[PDB]
Every structure is written in structure tokens, then in C-alpha cells.
Amino acid sequence: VSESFVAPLEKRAENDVPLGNDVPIIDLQQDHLVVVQQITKACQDFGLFQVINHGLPEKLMAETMDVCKEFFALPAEEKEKLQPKGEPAKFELPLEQKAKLYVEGEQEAFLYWKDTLAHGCHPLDEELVNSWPEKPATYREVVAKYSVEVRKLTMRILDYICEGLGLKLGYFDNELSQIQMMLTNYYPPCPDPSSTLGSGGHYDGNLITLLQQNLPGLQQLIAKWIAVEPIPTAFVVNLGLTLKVITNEKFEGSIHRVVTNPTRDRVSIATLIGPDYSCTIEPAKELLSQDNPPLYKPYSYAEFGEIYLSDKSDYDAGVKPYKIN
Numbered sequence: 001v002s003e004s005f006v007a008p009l010e011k012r013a014e015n016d017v018p019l020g021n022d023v024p025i026i027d028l029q030q031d032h033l034v035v036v037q038q039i040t041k042a043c044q045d046f047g048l049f050q051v052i053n054h055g056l057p058e059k060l061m062a063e064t065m066d067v068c069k070e071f072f073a074l075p076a077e078e079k080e081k082l083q084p085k086g087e088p089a090k091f092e093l094p095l096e097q098k099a100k101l102y103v104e105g106e107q108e109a110f111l112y113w114k115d116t117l118a119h120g121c122h123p124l125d126e127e128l129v130n131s132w133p134e135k136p137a138t139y140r141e142v143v144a145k146y147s148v149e150v151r152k153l154t155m156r157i158l159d160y161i162c163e164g165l166g167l168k169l170g171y172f173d174n175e176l177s178q179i180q181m182m183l184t185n186y187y188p189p190c191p192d193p194s195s196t197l198g199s200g201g202h203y204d205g206n207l208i209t210l211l212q213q214n215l216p217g218l219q220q221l222i223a224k225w226i227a228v229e230p231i232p233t234a235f236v237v238n239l240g241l242t243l244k245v246i247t248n249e250k251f252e253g254s255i256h257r258v259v260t261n262p263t264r265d266r267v268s269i270a271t272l273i274g275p276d277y278s279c280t281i282e283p284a285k286e287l288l289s290q291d292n293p294p295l296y297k298p299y300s301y302a303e304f305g306e307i308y309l310s311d312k313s314d315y316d317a318g319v320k321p322y323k324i325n
């Protein structure tokens, strides 16, 4: 592989990462209180769980994976239409909601073995959808339906979380969930998987992420890495750094990475829901007391975003400046 993609020695993945047998798989068609309790335990102990029988149509999940794979099968001349000034966009502010192809890495500067299609999904209007990919022909109609359904499921999970925390229902149904970035991640086969990463270890900076996958490669840090079993009809729920802060660390954030494969490609669909850049983030005042003092001072999501996207010296470098007590 090009030296551009060689990860620092300490960040390279070992070849035999064990299956995470303790990753919670939560059936959302259990009794209401059982679902609340199981989600609450998973958020407190792990910060990563899968949801099944989640009410999002399996046919739509399959049709969305199909059109996402079809997009990444498009020729160069079509993909160039999503490369501003002839190259992929960077994950930096301002993060625009129009569709672009993105490159990502860390500055021992190296690049992730990954192509990402990203666009906003909320609110859905003619202007936003007109800024989505023109090809494949069915991308817009399928992904419009998918984005509405994934948001519906995310808001159900956030209200289960509200009941678990003792927050009012709809606590996150506001500016805290206003941004919905859909990241379609393409991992082509890699000649040297021992030296590269599809995605370096990270928290998602946002509130909550739902991830759809068909093939292995996703791993979680529990200094022990575990493999997250692909269930094609499930969503992986990753709690973000923003929810870790708002819950005053009552909930864990998911630290995860993606490893490369020498033989086959992989497509994942990540729906990243979180605050508008104008938001002020702080521990929920409703949960604070002399026994539970705030561990973070209030901060600008925009200010956090700039640090989160640039400083990868530590997983929580984004929130380090705002730590108190």
C-alpha cells in the first residue's frame, strides 16, 4: 500500500480480534419496561448495542444497502461530480449538508482506507434532496424513505434513554438532534491489512449513531478490542461523546474502529444524529446534585467540533478543555 495509508505502529490492528459475545442484542418487541431496562444497562455498561425487531422495514434496509453499493460501483466521471475542486472534501467545519465524497485521516499523518459519501437528511426538503447524488436514479427516493425511517427509530431509542435516565420524553427532540448526517462508507480490498485502518479508533462526536452493516470489520474498545458481529437486519447503536457529556458520564460513549480486508470490499451506512453547530452542550441540569456534580462546563458544539475533527491525540480530546471537578 501507499505510505499515505500506513498507520502508526501502536494504532495497527492485531490479526485475531475476538467476537464481542457480550455486545447486547436488544429485541425492541419485548415489553416496554424490559426494552427501557435493557437499553439503559447497555448504555451504562457498554455504549454500543444492536437492536432487532426495530420496526424499520428489512426490505428498505436491503434496498438502501443495494443503492449505496450501486453508488460506489459508479465510474470516476460520475464520482468526480461529488469532489469539490477535483478532490474529496475534508471532515472540517463548516460541514455542509449537500452530498460530497470525503477523505479522512489523522495529523505521523496518515489516511484511513475509506471513501465516505456524506449528506444531511433533516429536515427533508426539495433543496436538500436536489443536492444528493443524481446516480443511481433511485438513490434519492430510497434514501429519503430510509432517512425518515432511521430518524423515527433513533427518536424511539432516545425516548427509551429518556425513561432510563428519568428525563422527560422528547428531551432530545429539539436542537440536540437537528443534524442527521448519513455517511455511506466504502472499504475497498486492502493489500496490507496489518498496516492500515478503515477508520481509526474514535467516539462519534454527535449524540447517537445507527450503523447498518452486512460484513465484518467493525471493532469496539472495551486496551482490549472486540469484533462487533454483523447482523444484516439489525442496527448497531453507538452512543456519541455528546450523550456521554449530557448524561454526566452515567452512559459510556462507543469507542470503535474499522479494519480492512485483503479479499472483499465492505459498505456500511452510518446515520449520525446530533446537535446543530449553534448548540450549547452541558450535563443535563435535571440529573445534577451535590452527589452528582457536573464533570463538564457548558461549551459551544461548533468549538468542540473543530477540536474533535482535528485533535486525535486522545479519544476525548474534543471534550478535554471542558472537563471540571
Ligand SMILES: CN1[C@H]2C[C@H](OC(=O)[C@H](CO)c3ccccc3)C[C@@H]1[C@@H](O)C2
Binding pocket: 091, 095, 104, 179, 181, 183, 199, 202, 203, 204, 205, 206, 270, 272, 274, 304, 305, 308, 309
Ligand atoms: C470516523 N469519522 C468520525 C469523525 C467524523 O464525524 C463527523 O463528521 C460527524 C458528523 O455529524 C461529526 C460529529 C460531531 C462533530 C462534528 C462532526 C466522520 C467519521 C464519523 O464516523 C466519526
Ligand SMILES: [Fe+2]
Binding pocket: 202, 203, 204, 256
Ligand atoms: Fe464512528
Ligand SMILES: [Sr+2]
Binding pocket: 080, 083, 086, 087, 088
Ligand atoms: Sr479527482
Ligand SMILES: [Sr+2]
Binding pocket: 130, 131, 132
Ligand atoms: Sr443538484
